[PDB]
Amino acid sequence: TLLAKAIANECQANFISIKGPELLTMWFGESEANVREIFDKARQAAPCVLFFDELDSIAKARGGNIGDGGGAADRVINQILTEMDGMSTKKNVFIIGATNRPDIIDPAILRPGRLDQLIYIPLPDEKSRVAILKANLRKSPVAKDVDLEFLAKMTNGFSGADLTEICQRACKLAIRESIESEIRRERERQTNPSAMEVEEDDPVPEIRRDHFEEAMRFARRSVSDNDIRKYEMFAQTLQQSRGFGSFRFPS
Amino acid sequence: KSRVAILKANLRKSPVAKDVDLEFLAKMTNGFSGADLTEICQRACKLAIRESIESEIRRERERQTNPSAMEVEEDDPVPEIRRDHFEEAMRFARRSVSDNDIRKYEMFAQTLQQSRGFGSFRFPS
Amino acid sequence: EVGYDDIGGCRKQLAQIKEMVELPLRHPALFKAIGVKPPRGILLYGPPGTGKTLIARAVANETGAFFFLINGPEIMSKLAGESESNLRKAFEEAEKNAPAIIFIDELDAIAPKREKTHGEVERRIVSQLLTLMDGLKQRAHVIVMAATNRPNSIDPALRRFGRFDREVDIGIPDATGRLEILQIHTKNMKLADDVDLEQVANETHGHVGADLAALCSEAALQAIRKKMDLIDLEDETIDAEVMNSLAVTMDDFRWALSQSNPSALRETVVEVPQVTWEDIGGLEDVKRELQELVQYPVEHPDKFLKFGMTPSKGVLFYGPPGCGKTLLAKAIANECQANFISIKGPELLTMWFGESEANVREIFDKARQAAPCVLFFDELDSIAKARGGNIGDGGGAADRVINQILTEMDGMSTKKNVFIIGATNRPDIIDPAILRPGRLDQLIYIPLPDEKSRVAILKANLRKSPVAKDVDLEFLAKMTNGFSGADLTEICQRACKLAIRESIESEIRRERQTQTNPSAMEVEEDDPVPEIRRDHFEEAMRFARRSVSDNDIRKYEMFAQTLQQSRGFGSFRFPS
Numbered sequence: 001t002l003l004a005k006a007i008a009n010e011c012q013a014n015f016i017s018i019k020g021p022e023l024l025t026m027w028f029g030e031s032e033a034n035v036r037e038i039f040d041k042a043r044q045a046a047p048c049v050l051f052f053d054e055l056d057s058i059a060k061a062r063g064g065n066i067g068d069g070g071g072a073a074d075r076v077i078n079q080i081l082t083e084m085d086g087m088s089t090k091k092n093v094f095i096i097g098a099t100n101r102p103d104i105i106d107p108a109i110l111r112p113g114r115l116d117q118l119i120y121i122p123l124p125d126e127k128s129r130v131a132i133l134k135a136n137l138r139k140s141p142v143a144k145d146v147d148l149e150f151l152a153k154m155t156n157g158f159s160g161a162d163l164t165e166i167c168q169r170a171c172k173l174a175i176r177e178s179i180e181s182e183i184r185r186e187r188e189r190q191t192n193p194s195a196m197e198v199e200e201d202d203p204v205p206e207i208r209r210d211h212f213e214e215a216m217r218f219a220r221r222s223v224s225d226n227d228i229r230k231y232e233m234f235a236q237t238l239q240q241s242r243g244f245g246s247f248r249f250p251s
Numbered sequence: 252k253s254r255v256a257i258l259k260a261n262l263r264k265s266p267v268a269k270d271v272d273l274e275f276l277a278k279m280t281n282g283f284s285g286a287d288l289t290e291i292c293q294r295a296c297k298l299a300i301r302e303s304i305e306s307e308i309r310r311e312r313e314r315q316t317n318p319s320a321m322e323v324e325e326d327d328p329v330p331e332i333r334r335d336h337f338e339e340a341m342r343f344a345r346r347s348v349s350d351n352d353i354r355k356y357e358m359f360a361q362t363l364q365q366s367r368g369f370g371s372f373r374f375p376s
Numbered sequence: 377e378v379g380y381d382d383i384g385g386c387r388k389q390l391a392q393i394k395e396m397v398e399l400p401l402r403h404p405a406l407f408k409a410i411g412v413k414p415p416r417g418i419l420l421y422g423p424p425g426t427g428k429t430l431i432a433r434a435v436a437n438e439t440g441a442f443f444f445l446i447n448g449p450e451i452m453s454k455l456a457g458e459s460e461s462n463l464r465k466a467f468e469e470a471e472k473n474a475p476a477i478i479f480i481d482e483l484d485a486i487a488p489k490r491e492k493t494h495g496e497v498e499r500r501i502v503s504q505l506l507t508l509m510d511g512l513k514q515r516a517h518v519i520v521m522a523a524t525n526r527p528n529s530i531d532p533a534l535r536r537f538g539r540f541d542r543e544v545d546i547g548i549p550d551a552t553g554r555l556e557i558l559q560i561h562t563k564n565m566k567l568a569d570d571v572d573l574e575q576v577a578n579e580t581h582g583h584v585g586a587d588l589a590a591l592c593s594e595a596a597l598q599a600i601r602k603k604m605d606l607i608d609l610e611d612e613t614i615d616a617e618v619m620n621s622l623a624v625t626m627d628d629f630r631w632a633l634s635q636s637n638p639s640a641l642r643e644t645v646v647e648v649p650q651v652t653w654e655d656i657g658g659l660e661d662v663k664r665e666l667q668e669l670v671q672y673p674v675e676h677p678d679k680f681l682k683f684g685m686t687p688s689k690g691v692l693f694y695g696p697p698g699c700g701k702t703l704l705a706k707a708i709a710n711e712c713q714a715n716f717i718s719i720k721g722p723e724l725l726t727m728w729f730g731e732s733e734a735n736v737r738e739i740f741d742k743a744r745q746a747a748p749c750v751l752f753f754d755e756l757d758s759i760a761k762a763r764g765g766n767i768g769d770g771g772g773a774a775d776r777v778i779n780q781i782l783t784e785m786d787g788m789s790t791k792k793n794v795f796i797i798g799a800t801n802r803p804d805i806i807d808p809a810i811l812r813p814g815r816l817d818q819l820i821y822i823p824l825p826d827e828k829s830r831v832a833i834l835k836a837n838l839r840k841s842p843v844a845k846d847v848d849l850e851f852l853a854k855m856t857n858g859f860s861g862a863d864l865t866e867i868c869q870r871a872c873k874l875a876i877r878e879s880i881e882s883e884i885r886r887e888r889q890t891q892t893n894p895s896a897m898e899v900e901e902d903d904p905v906p907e908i909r910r911d912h913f914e915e916a917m918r919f920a921r922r923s924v925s926d927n928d929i930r931k932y933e934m935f936a937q938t939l940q941q942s943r944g945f946g947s948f949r950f951p952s
């Protein structure tokens with residue numbers, strides 16, 4: 001989702017995001033004409049990047065291992081395909097689809113004239129992890145003592161969500177410690193009224209190494225290696241053959 | 252290159268005319284296995300042998316009717332596997348290994364791969 | 377005034393209207409001495425903005441008939457009890473100036489009742505209009521033409537004999553008609569030399585005559601905004617020479633096209649496909665068979681009648697995806713110069729999910745109106761796949777949409793012009809009833825393109841792109857042992873993409889070089905990559921892939937030999 005937003009920002013084009021709950025609502029309510037309205041709205045706001053976040057939600061709702069007796073076709077995806085086929089006229093709307101379950105996605109979605117350009121987003125690398133940590137912690141006051149590159153490198157396979165959770169937990173620990181400390185310090189001034197008022201400011205003005213260590217103590221890898229293995233399988237399921245790698249013209 | 256080498260090795264014993272461009276045959280065989288190339292070579296040799304036996308026999312059958320009739324010229328109707336024999340062989344060319352089970356082999360090779368994320372590993376300087 | 381020249385689009389229904397109305401109007405005295413009933417009413421229907429009123433006015437002017445226009449809401453906006461007076465007076469006045477043409481624009485407002493018929497006064501208006509329309513005493517020559525978006529929107533009694541007994545669907549103009557509409561709408565703006573109106577016409581798919589006029593006006597306004605505003609020299613009346621100095625550039629038209637929003641892109645297209653047999657490199661047996669089945673009954677109907685044989689009006693293409701079945705259908709339609717209607721799978725799936733199969737009736741009626749036509753049901757197996765294919769539903773292959781299609785086909789053949797073509801990538805799951813006689817019985821198998829076919833496909837895909845003569849195409853086609861048409865198209869597109877990226881990156885760097893190091897003398901070396909080269913194609917082929925596996929080709933071969941002509945009659949000889 002962030003990548004789609006960034007690409008929209010670079011082109012300075014309007015961004016429309018259709019999350020999975022909206023698609024599920026259209027599917028449960030048997031109201032797919034909303035797809036027509038959504039596409040018309042995207043057409044009006046041109047240049048736009050129409051992003052269908054978590055497009056595989058309907059397939060998951062119907063199953064995924066056994067599912068319904070019928071095929072992958074569903075009402076909402078069929079309407080989306082009809083709108084896309086009737087699209088391209090506008091020359092401005094660009095459809096971006098994100099799916100965590102490529103195996104269950106309808107194959108018709110990937111046919112030419114549809115979302116054919118498949119892009120694989122892998123788990124963030126060490127440098128990518130450092131950047132994600134910096135972005136998450138840009139607003140929060142972080143002490144220079146806490147080394148971020150070391151933390152990013154330490155996280156062997158943490159996802160962006162996992163890094164965000166670690167940062168949020170560290171901030172929560174810092175907030176709780178600051179609140180508890182200033183609360184006690186206020187008792188100390190109520191219990192023993194000091195003759196001269198001299199506030200020492202905040203006992204914890206910025207996030208320190210100990211906060212991050214305690215937060216990382218609870219760090220967790222949300223994404224298991226088996227689902228990464230399935231994604232690697234699909235990626236190599238879009239394999240460019242194995243006999244043309246040396247293709248040379250006759251000269 | 253491996254296909255060219257396999258074709259050369261299979262045809263070393265058989266007398267193959269220099270005119271036949273074996274590299275073209277190897278490159279045209281997109282995904283044939285070694286067994287398929289050996290089968291093609293064997294079929295070409297069989298075609299050459301059948302043609303030689305039929306032509307020499309039919310010549311002898313006609314010649315034997317008149318005693319000493321035609322000259323004593325020692326003709327070899329087919330003395331080497333010709334190009335037409337190789338086209339004859341390729342007409343029956345078959346792909347033994349389907350792309351799906353090659354997919355399965357590459358799948359097992361990926362599963363055996365050393366995970367991911369340790370490529371950039373470097374000791375601290 | 378307005379005439380046939382003003383009427384653009386060359387959509388070939390204006391000719392039909394002419395043939396309809398000359399003698400009733402051009403030769404009115406002739407019908408006095410001959411006992412024949414002329415066309416009392418003609419119902420022109422189609423998408424709004426298609427020039428129906430313009431067509432009626434042009435016909436009235438070119439035939440000399442007194443044209444009378446009865447605006448729908450003009451009478452509807454009048455007070456109840458006196459609007460009926462307006463309609464009656466309109467008919468009387470048109471009666472006085474015999475011959476006369478009475479045009480009722482927006483007829484779906486005066487008589488919108490589709491048997492729902494809400495209200496009270498509107499029922500009076502519809503009934504009185506019915507009395508007047510049926511009250512034509514066949515005296516004089518008043519012809520009542522009406523405009524309506526769709527035939528079913530107006531009251532059915534208006535559609536009955538003697539009120540509106542014949543209908544013409546003006547429909548959306550086509551590329552040729554879009555170009556002619558652009559020419560008619562661009563004749564006094566002094567169009568620039570660079571702009572040709574041909575590229576704009578091709579890119580103008582989905583627009584109507586009103587849309588074309590609006591796009592031209594928007595381009596003119598962009599030209600006026602770009603120039604002559606900077607100078608800001610304005611008076612009560614802009615100087616003619618100053619305004620003439622400007623020329624509408626291609627960029628302005630491109631921006632206008634970007635800002636078009638055509639008013640009915642979704643409407644179904646009835647157009648003669650521009651595809652030709654050249655695009656498909658082969659299928660000679662298939663090409664000849666298609667030529668037979670479609671072209672022979674019409675080119676030589678007499679010989680078909682002589683032997684008492686009724687030609688099959690249905691053909692079902694089966695084969696792997698991306699082999700050109702849709703293109704083959706378009707080519708066969710083009711050779712016969714017959715309108716082509718394509719019903720893709722999404723439409724069938726929409727009708728099935730929505731439980732609305734009456735659309736099949738509407739589709740068949742539209743195909744019937746646009747005769748000669750080739751009604752193609754692309755990817756007809758979509759519903760079967762949606763319901764399953766290996767296990768599927770508990771029921772059989774029968775489904776609502778296919779059943780409606782079968783009913784329409786059984787009720788078809790009367791028209792003698794509509795030809796049904798079906799394409800399916802899963803012949804095994806297709807309903808058997810589809811293949812019964814009187815249906816799509818002629819099964820045609822489209823195999824993977826051969827080496828020569830592959831060469832032709834590559835040439836067709838790369839015809840527009842600048843391809844260097846160095847890159848040998850026959851070698852590439854031969855190299856691709858089993859690539860489908862889609863695979864070859866993907867390879868060509870990837871090569872073009874690589875060339876475009878390289879050209880963009882190179883000229884971008886070259887521009888840095890001038891910005892970083894301003895050269896004393898400006899001497900552009902032109903484009904660093906002017907055409908697609910061997911290296912681009914080699915890199916693209918590096919990613920070439922075979923979409924169609926050999927196992928699905930094996931299943932198609934099985935079905936093909938599942939239509940096996942026995943094994944004992946091959947030597948059948950008569951006793952002599």
Ligand SMILES: Cc1cc(OCc2nnc(SC3CCCC3)n2-c2cccnc2)ccc1-c1ccc(S(C)(=O)=O)cc1
Nearest residue numbers: 008011012013047048049090091092093094579634840841
């Ligand atoms: C020239 C051209 C431009 C185009 O459109 C460009 C465009 N403008 N705004 C946008 S959208 C906005 C941008 C950021 C967010 C979205 N786009 C656009 C188009 C496609 C993909 N992404 C963007 C289409 C098609 C063509 C052409 C190509 C070949 C030929 S011929 C007969 O073979 O010689 C004729 C016509």
Ligand SMILES: Cc1cc(OCc2nnc(SC3CCCC3)n2-c2cccnc2)ccc1-c1ccc(S(C)(=O)=O)cc1
Nearest residue numbers: 673674677680681684685687688712714748749792793795
């Ligand atoms: C003579 C005839 C013509 C016909 O129709 C010809 C036709 N015209 N436009 C078209 S359509 C257009 C053409 C290109 C796209 C579609 N067609 C047509 C008909 C069938 C298949 N394809 C086209 C039907 C049936 C007959 C006859 C055959 C035998 C007998 S008897 C009693 O046994 O002696 C009586 C009548």
Ligand SMILES: Nc1ncnc2c1ncn2[C@@H]1O[C@H](COP(=O)(O)OP(=O)(O)O)[C@@H](O)[C@H]1O
Nearest residue numbers: 382383384385424425426427428429430585586
């Ligand atoms: N083929 C054409 N040639 C010239 N003008 C056209 C054409 N098609 C549509 N128009 C424009 O459409 C405008 C209004 O459309 P109209 O003729 O009233 O059809 P409708 O009543 O169905 O909306 C006209 O003012 C005319 O300029």
